[PDB]
Amino acid sequence: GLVPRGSHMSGATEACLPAGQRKSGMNINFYQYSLKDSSTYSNAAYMAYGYASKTKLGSVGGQTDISIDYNIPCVSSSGTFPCPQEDSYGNWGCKGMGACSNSQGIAYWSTDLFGFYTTPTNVTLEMTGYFLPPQTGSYTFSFATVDDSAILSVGGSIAFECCAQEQPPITSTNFTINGIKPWDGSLPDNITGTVYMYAGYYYPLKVVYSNAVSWGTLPISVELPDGTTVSDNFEGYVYSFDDDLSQSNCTIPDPSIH
Template identity: 30%
Template sequence: GFKGNAYYYPWSSYNYAAKKGTQNTKLYTQSSYLNGGYVGSGKVITSGHTADYTVPNVIAYDITATNLSYSNSGLCETAQCSGNWGFHMTGYIIPPTTGNYTISLGYVDDLGILNLGAGKFLSGNCCGNFDITGDISGTNTVQSIWSSSGPTGTNQITAYLYAGVSYPVEVFHVNRGALGAITLTYKDPSGVVSSNFGGIVYHYNDLD
């Protein structure tokens, strides 16, 4: 499966007395944030520390997952809900069968970026070629931002992959607050669609 880190996405401003924040609706598309700024100080947030809720930080390192799709609907219904987070997950696609594979971001709230065979794989700058206009340059193969009518930009790619060959892949996602979701699936050469990447994506520990 995938392996990576989870990050805290900051409020634009925060009232500590009222315990309410204002969503930061701009930071997550800015190059300074996407080019590694999402890591913040690099220190993990702990329950006993005094937090500055207006700066990025780390929630957890070295998390693993085979399914990156989720929705917090029903758990996070208010505008002040602490759904401010994101993740950067990496791995290697090693197809069991040669043929066309389609990877899709069926839904994203608020930002999803996927690189396949990317030159920036495993670097701090996961998203340097992201363009909010929907244009794709360089290595950002799939990128999409939430809109009321559905995902914008390019949210699907089909690639001919060879069985047994390792293809670097990374997924970057941000929910800027309140409701959040992402739906990531792949369709194999036989036409089967799945959100479980356990039998096709591996990380270093899997390959040892």
């Protein structure tokens, strides 16, 4: 065969070749989410697009460092310091700080999430951008843990539409990683999803993340085809492009034959 046959029954993930000015990093949009609401974020429709029906709080662009690790304050005898969740104890104190005088169950304001001043105790955020694979092959994305609820989607018409990064969210619930908080209360660590990607094509990437109370955590990694792992800092891998809905050739439905 002069040419490759193509992935079977058009199984290839859709990718993009945006012709505009590339910008390092992902865009982060922040949306309202109610303190102690442990039900809203348990719905697939909400995590895919419904989040954007709530008040938009703000945004920051150009973010390459994308893992979430938010610790609430312990108001202690020696001042106010963030408590690592594993160091919290009793009712309650923080190891090396003694007893904390403040409630675990109120809203707290902080710039910890990408420098945006908001309430990381209770918020939903949407990260959008394009993932640029340097190598052709299988990529395994993972969340080490999820506190409270999250999804990761990769691909044109799954994350968002090519050359349309800034548009309202699409409705696809075909998540690459489903880390939605179960109604039943369950859910395990190191949750994963794999995508076969072709080098030099730009793959739409969406992460939606929500927290209702206190600590928030979402450590994001990808394992490359060469078996190495990139964690937290995706510099060199993730990019944004301004919308160009007029770029006719932007969508590549099958990179395996393009």
